[PDB]
Design a protein around this ligand. Sequence first.
Ligand SMILES: COc1ccc2cc([C@H](C)C(=O)O)ccc2c1
Ligand SMILES: COc1ccc2cc([C@H](C)C(=O)O)ccc2c1
Length: 580
Amino acid sequence: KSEIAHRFNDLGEKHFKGLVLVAFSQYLQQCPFEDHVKLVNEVTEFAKKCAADESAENCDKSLHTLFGDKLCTVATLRATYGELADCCEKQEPERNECFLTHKDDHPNLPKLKPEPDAQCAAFQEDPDKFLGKYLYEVARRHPYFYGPELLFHAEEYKADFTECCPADDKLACLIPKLDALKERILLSSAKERLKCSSFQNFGERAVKAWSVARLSQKFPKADFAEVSKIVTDLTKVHKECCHGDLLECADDRADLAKYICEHQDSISGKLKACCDKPLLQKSHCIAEVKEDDLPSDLPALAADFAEDKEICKHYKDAKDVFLGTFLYEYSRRHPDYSVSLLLRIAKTYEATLEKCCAEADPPACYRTVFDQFTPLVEEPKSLVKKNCDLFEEVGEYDFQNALIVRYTKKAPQVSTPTLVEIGRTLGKVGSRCCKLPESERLPCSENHLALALNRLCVLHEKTPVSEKITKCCTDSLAERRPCFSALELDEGYVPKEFKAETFTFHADICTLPEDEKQIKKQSALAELVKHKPKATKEQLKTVLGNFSAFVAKCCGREDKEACFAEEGPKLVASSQLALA
Ligand SMILES: COc1ccc2cc([C@H](C)C(=O)O)ccc2c1
Ligand SMILES: COc1ccc2cc([C@H](C)C(=O)O)ccc2c1
């Protein structure tokens, strides 16, 4: 009826305003905070005026016409987003499509730094404005963040400041919390970007297959009917969020959380905890829920999926069902596999049937089908064991450095900040996954690599530089990791010209936190590879150890700058000799 009334009634003023603030920040990432808050109140007012009189003018326009109209009222649009004004000429959905495409995955804004005194200050004098700002800062940095999940984090962030602002020593309560939360924002953001990237680049059918694999591992006791239903509904939730439809996305999400809690007995014993919780906790808890124990009545699969003579007839009849069922069954018994491994096994199952059923004796052919999955399984298992050995041997920083070398060799045309960001994210896959019980390491590692590879692809979408990267990013979602693992030193590379200043250090580096010192060195390392692509990881490890030693020394000196100045250029030249 009035779609905007309806959502307002369903969501209530607070959340309504929340999600409307996020939406606007993510669509207009540059606008001062004040204008968004203003645009938000205006829509909220119209919403209220509509809830009271659904028959009133323009109350029956769709949401996107309404928000699209509000965004296009914003002043200096053509100075702030010269590229956006254009979308404003268009109708809907054309208009929305246009804003979407214009979203910025790397607006490269200032780092959100916890200034606890000035933040506790700002919080006390106005809690609503302080939290609203938080949503804006985060939304505009992560224009595809899972809308409703941000309202959830903003609660945590509120609890953070509520506990630490009266607390004794302020920063030491608050700074480990805000760092922890930031880590969760970044992972959360990555998980969602992969979902939306999957919608954009591979379509729903791919998003559903992913979801079937995953939800079956999590809910191995639910039947297939029940899995299909949730996947159907969840896909619709994320489709909407990814399309910028946040109010509908949230409303649909609450519906699904309620469905799931009505049925937790047919779904999972692990939901109990989640279901006893308030709305936003509940959804978050369901979203992040752990895998239930395997039922003791899992069916052998030989019979229907390898022995049956009718398989061909069954498969031809309705492929997507028979295959979905296969995927449901294989995944439910394999929480020890990664989602992409499962999706790879499903394409091989499928590929094997396409093949065998075309042959004169399909049953003699498809009978060994499960034995084709073996190589699929051991390849990633050994790749994880290998990288976990290396990691436990050399620790995060060196593991990252090995990854930054590996990736700069694979894609030397990518900018150093990106190679560094990625190599660093990749290395944190080790820290996270390698310490886990052994059978969890494969799924952790690959599911996490998916997130980081997709981040590389996303950046690469805005700034394309390498064809090998394009190919891996666009070929097959399921083959993405194996496609990247397979790249080697790009042989067509032309060593970047040497530029002394790049590798020249100064005293300023001395008062950066460790975290930031590393990035400085790690950038130099990428630069070392670009200029000398053929040097082995071992030569680079040694040369960088020298650079590290030189920095420690000079920063420790009475005269830091004469140290850097006298020692640097010598180390700069001799180090090229070691990279021959
Ligand atoms: C309902 O059966 C399916 C449907 C689509 C799929 C897609 C993929 C990967 C993600 C792809 O690259 O398209 C894998 C397995 C699938 C099984
Ligand atoms: C368990 O820890 C890891 C961490 C990073 C990894 C990166 C890669 C990439 C895809 C590569 O190109 O080799 C593979 C495996 C990995 C396992």
